[PDB]
Amino acid sequence: PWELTILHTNDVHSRLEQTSEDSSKCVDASRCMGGVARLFTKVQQIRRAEPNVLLLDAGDQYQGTIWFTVYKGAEVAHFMNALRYDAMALGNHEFDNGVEGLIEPLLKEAKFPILSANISASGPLASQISGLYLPYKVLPVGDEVVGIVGYTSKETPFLSNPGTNLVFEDEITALQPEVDKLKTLNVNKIIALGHSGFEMDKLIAQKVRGVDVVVGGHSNTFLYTGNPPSKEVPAGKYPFIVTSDDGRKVPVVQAYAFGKYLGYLKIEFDERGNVISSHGNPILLDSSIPEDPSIKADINKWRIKLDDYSTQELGKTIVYLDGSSQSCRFRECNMGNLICDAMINNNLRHADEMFWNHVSMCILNGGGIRSPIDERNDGTITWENLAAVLPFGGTFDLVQLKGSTLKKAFEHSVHRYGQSTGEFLQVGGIHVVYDLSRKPGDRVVKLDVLCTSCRVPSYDPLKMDEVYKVILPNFLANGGDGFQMIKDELLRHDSGDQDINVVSTYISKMKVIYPAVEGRIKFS
Amino acid sequence: PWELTILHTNDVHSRLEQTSEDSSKCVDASRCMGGVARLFTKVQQIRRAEPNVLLLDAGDQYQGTIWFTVYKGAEVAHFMNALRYDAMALGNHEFDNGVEGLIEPLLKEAKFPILSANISASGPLASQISGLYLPYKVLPVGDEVVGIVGYTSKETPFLSNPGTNLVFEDEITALQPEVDKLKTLNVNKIIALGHSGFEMDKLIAQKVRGVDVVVGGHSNTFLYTGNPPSKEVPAGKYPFIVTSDDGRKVPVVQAYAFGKYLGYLKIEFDERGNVISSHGNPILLDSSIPEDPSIKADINKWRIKLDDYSTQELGKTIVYLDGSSQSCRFRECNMGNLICDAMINNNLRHADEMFWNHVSMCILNGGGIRSPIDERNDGTITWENLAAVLPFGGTFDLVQLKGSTLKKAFEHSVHRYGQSTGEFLQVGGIHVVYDLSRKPGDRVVKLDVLCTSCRVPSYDPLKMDEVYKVILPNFLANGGDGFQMIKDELLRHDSGDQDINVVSTYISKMKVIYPAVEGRIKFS
Ligand SMILES: [Ca+2]
Ligand SMILES: [Ca+2]
Ligand SMILES: [Zn+2]
Ligand SMILES: [Zn+2]
Ligand SMILES: [Zn+2]
Ligand SMILES: [Zn+2]
Structure with a gap:
């Protein structure tokens, strides 16, 4: 032979x-x-x-x-x-x-x-x-x-x-x-x-x-x-x-x-x-x-x-980039909004007449955000600064999730709220309202998501049987931070770009950033 | 002499x-x-x-x-x-x-x-x-x-x-x-x-x-x-x-x-x-x-x-830019959001340690938005297209308004709602909720505005006695579309950049735009 x-x-x-x-x-x-x-x-x-x-x-x-x-x-x-x-x-x-x-x-x-x-x-x-x-x-x-x-x-x-x-x-x-x-x-x-x-x-x-x-x-x-x-x-x-x-x-x-x-x-x-x-x-x-x-x-x-x-300077921020755990594990934080907006921007791909973009939605666990960035260094942001925020070398991946799975993920996000745990979700293309007076597992009282199959993007209630594309850390796609439902129920998963690189590219393109806290996440 | x-x-x-x-x-x-x-x-x-x-x-x-x-x-x-x-x-x-x-x-x-x-x-x-x-x-x-x-x-x-x-x-x-x-x-x-x-x-x-x-x-x-x-x-x-x-x-x-x-x-x-x-x-x-x-x-x-x-192409949109009157005179429209976001971006000036930017807020009457822009010309946006949206040769000016004046402007925005009149306001840096079942003059039930004197921008209730900087068309600063309260009560007014130019510059900087309807304006 x-x-x-x-x-x-x-x-x-x-x-x-x-x-x-x-x-x-x-x-x-x-x-x-x-x-x-x-x-x-x-x-x-x-x-x-x-x-x-x-x-x-x-x-x-x-x-x-x-x-x-x-x-x-x-x-x-x-x-x-x-x-x-x-x-x-x-x-x-x-x-x-x-x-x-x-x-x-x-x-x-x-x-x-x-x-x-x-x-x-x-x-x-x-x-x-x-x-x-x-x-x-x-x-x-x-x-x-x-x-x-x-x-x-x-x-x-x-x-x-x-x-x-x-x-x-x-x-x-x-x-x-x-x-x-x-x-x-x-x-x-x-x-x-x-x-x-x-x-x-x-x-x-x-x-x-x-x-x-x-x-x-x-x-x-x-x-x-x-x-x-x-x-x-x-x-x-x-x-x-x-x-x-x-x-x-x-x-x-x-x-x-x-x-x-x-x-x-x-x-x-x-x-x-x-x-x-x-x-x-x-x-x-x-x-x-x-x-x-x-x-x-x-x-x-x-x-x-x-x-x-x-x-070297990648770009500037005119706002404090609040990546503190006291913010990002408890409420909407502007660092989370920045990173999710960068994730969505990185996933803009060519589109036909059936969608403005194939994906519109992002989730990011607060436990994945590891530092703020202070704007008082003449607004400068460097790669080194971003590596303090995102130190784990992961990727921001694309998954397909039923609405029911995504609802379970948002329930998990607040199931033990108040302990500064990592599973609390920052978002993009999603508006969520929680009522923490309800029982764990039943705290999500509103969950609206940005359409893809539409010429004007707008928010509509999440549908339990419909499959949504979501950009999220590989850590979560793999069931990290207790998100076992994502790992077990996802219908497709493809590895995306490096976490730091996604944010760096967005900052470099935008030149000057000013992310706000704007009501993506609310509490009754 | x-x-x-x-x-x-x-x-x-x-x-x-x-x-x-x-x-x-x-x-x-x-x-x-x-x-x-x-x-x-x-x-x-x-x-x-x-x-x-x-x-x-x-x-x-x-x-x-x-x-x-x-x-x-x-x-x-x-x-x-x-x-x-x-x-x-x-x-x-x-x-x-x-x-x-x-x-x-x-x-x-x-x-x-x-x-x-x-x-x-x-x-x-x-x-x-x-x-x-x-x-x-x-x-x-x-x-x-x-x-x-x-x-x-x-x-x-x-x-x-x-x-x-x-x-x-x-x-x-x-x-x-x-x-x-x-x-x-x-x-x-x-x-x-x-x-x-x-x-x-x-x-x-x-x-x-x-x-x-x-x-x-x-x-x-x-x-x-x-x-x-x-x-x-x-x-x-x-x-x-x-x-x-x-x-x-x-x-x-x-x-x-x-x-x-x-x-x-x-x-x-x-x-x-x-x-x-x-x-x-x-x-x-x-x-x-x-x-x-x-x-x-x-x-x-x-x-x-x-x-x-x-x-010539200034940049691209991947979304339909809905500047129709049926949208922009009745509800939040994504063309209005685009123009207000361009207005805020044009007014980013150097800031000290006391504000992230000196101005955070924008209003734009729907009667000032005169056309949509269709995204199916390979996404191209030209100056000529923008001139159809903004055909009047005006400017986007800076004013100082008490909160009480701004509340009156939002009441005026919906005082005769339902007739496709021009005074309905598109916004940036402002979240408004109307209850049209209430009497004219008492329909604004929530009005939150983006802070300036803050390192992390966030929304807070409008305060009646506080003076806000607002970017708005010269037409409105001059009392057009019935906004007599703005003309009569403003505390400062400085002429700004040309309307088309403001939007053109923003599109050229962004390269690819995708404005959404995102809940800046809601109805109970
Ligand atoms: Ca053989
Ligand atoms: Ca003399
Ligand atoms: Zn690979
Ligand atoms: Zn591969
Ligand atoms: Zn002048
Ligand atoms: Zn002058």
Whole structure:
């Protein structure tokens, strides 16, 4: 048999530096993890030992830390080139700075092919981008070749800023003709590498005839065979085996997010390109693996500009930004309004005639707001100031929630009101009235929400059976602060932009901010 | 006696072209008035006939029409130079584009001295601006000399954008030493030319010893001796005679606004520079005076760029901008919210530790909103679109109103509700609740207003005895739409920026707008 070792990352999300165990800022180095310097060490070790290796990325290198804010993808090209990635699929966040912010720097600077078979362009853009990403690439590996066919979430227009020219086609529809073309070219070993989420990955494995392996991303899915090595709880075995409609067993892999793990899958192929066996597991990139000194020194050189940027003025406030717990855990606070307004602004995407914007609503737990910002430093706001407000390295995500779930969340917000607990909700696009004299669970007496399917935005009563898009911290989407109903009842969840970056961009665009307390939250 | 003819304009406010009788856009040419081409004809006629003539401007050439939006003061320098003005005082609106927007183009391009004795600078700005405006200038007139000493409203920091370096001193305090200096230099004929309003002009005439004549502005004051020639009602005789504390009679003049009139005052002086007599009247620049053909042709050449600008995209809306009367004369409408939010943004001025901004509140009669804007032209908004919404050429002014007056205005807003009348108020920084089942005059059941003297803006009940700053159309400050209580009870009133320009600037800054209906106005 011919044995291939697939090394894979996905949803690295700008974690160029090593991180804490929870993928926030590294504080206690002896317990830090990931980063590209440590990844380099492990990849180099494996390449010394195994003859046939591919290093693949399933997208979403863009977005996640100040690295992306400052270097805008140049860090991705540089460090992925240093790691010698063999191929990458486009993720949704590769469109965060528009198609221009993808073409330059990433597509023009990567030394490896960048792939997606289900994105097409028209008009002048089609000529500008032709050949800069590809549906697939056939790569030599030893004396053999392996075809790698890419794909990107069809939902990218709702989850990034690709513009109005690009069209994202159904993944399976686009993939099948490319995989059949590869068969006619005598390519019998085919990896589908792409960025649509574990559920779509399983459908691709089932339905796209000729795919031998699926290497996915987007959903931050952790798969593991055996006892988990850290705190992530597996969603299934690694690999996850799909029985295909052609009657093959097709392994599906993913490797969590944030560069914490290196995916590692060994596949044995017969002479006709059929998978005989597949086995492996993601490797936890913990501190037992040394950071490569050369990569680490280059990381430290690149960090200088980040340190400089972090103390520069982003914009000004003419109001005190009240992020105190005494305010934000007890009543509407103007820091909460600012952050929710920034969240909504970050999620303005292109709209058809059926909505002014696809999402209009925001919730933010007061426990997530960790500092005020004083306006008496000549009004200046810096990144460092924002990092005191939002210190946990999270994202502001998009979910779909039934009205009944959202009502339960607002009841939870005040179920033990008066104790300065973190679950009290700041809001945008929502007007809530509580009556604290009522029993816990029955304190929400009015709950109105901003329409989306309307040409003039206005507030209407929340409807229990209707599904609402809401922007909220990943912490809450994951059930933090007791919001188990959100985790258990949500109907869709996609990871969004970094928390600080969302607020920084809004402040920079607005130039001068003056958020008020304006009656979004009232008490009878 | 030595006879001097003083020709004077003030508060021309970008009326380069002839206007209608009410100083809006000229529609019926046979009834149009003013403009620089017609002014040229009349000034030239007078200079043919009278030996000793000065042509003076008392400030506020900046701001008022698309001319200023596009040419940013270059039109002021060019056409004032063509008219051969002899001197100009700085007005408050000369600071609308900051000190940089005054230095270039006006101070560097004017061929006449520009004056203000009560503005000082410090640090590098002082060196940059030194000598570009002057406290006074001594001008030869025939075989004599006349000193002209300038002044500018001490309130300019609240009424324009001068920045944080310039200091505006009390006018009388600054003027007296300059006038005494002129006496030591054997200058015995002294005109005070400046921009603080008729009330301050009378105080200057009374208290600044050695001033022979005051030529003022700012308050758009119409003075006339005899039957008025048009619709403006005189505030007093022309000249208005002040008895000075030195026991002289000192004439005070002003000439309305908008270039509709040319002020004309003849003064006889004795050999010692004492005024023997003064008489005159503003000259109505009506269509019986031909427009100078050469100036008119140059105006028409300069208009080409204005026509081009008027159809360019200023920014985008993703929402329908509902300026329909069926909405804005009956309930909160999102066009009204947009315009009030633009009004508040235009009035963000520098603030000390005692307020986040000096003004927080806006009212706008629905009768002033004359069109919607549809978002389905790729979201584009142009100046032409805004001119359909705001077609009357007015300004958004600053007033001080007792709470009791503002409550009466809100009662008036709904006193005959249900008839699609123009007085219904759109708002910003105000939350009102009406109960229409109550008697007219007693329908306002809640009225909360955004604080200014606060570091976190929030809403508090309106207080009847407290004085509030409010931004509102000049139409309403003048008692239009039945708001007689505003005209009769206001405690201060200063003219603001052009209505269209206020909204255009806000849209251009915001780039993408999405105003909602959000509960600023509710009905029980
Ligand atoms: Ca195969
Ligand atoms: Ca004198
Ligand atoms: Zn991701
Ligand atoms: Zn993704
Ligand atoms: Zn004026
Ligand atoms: Zn003025």
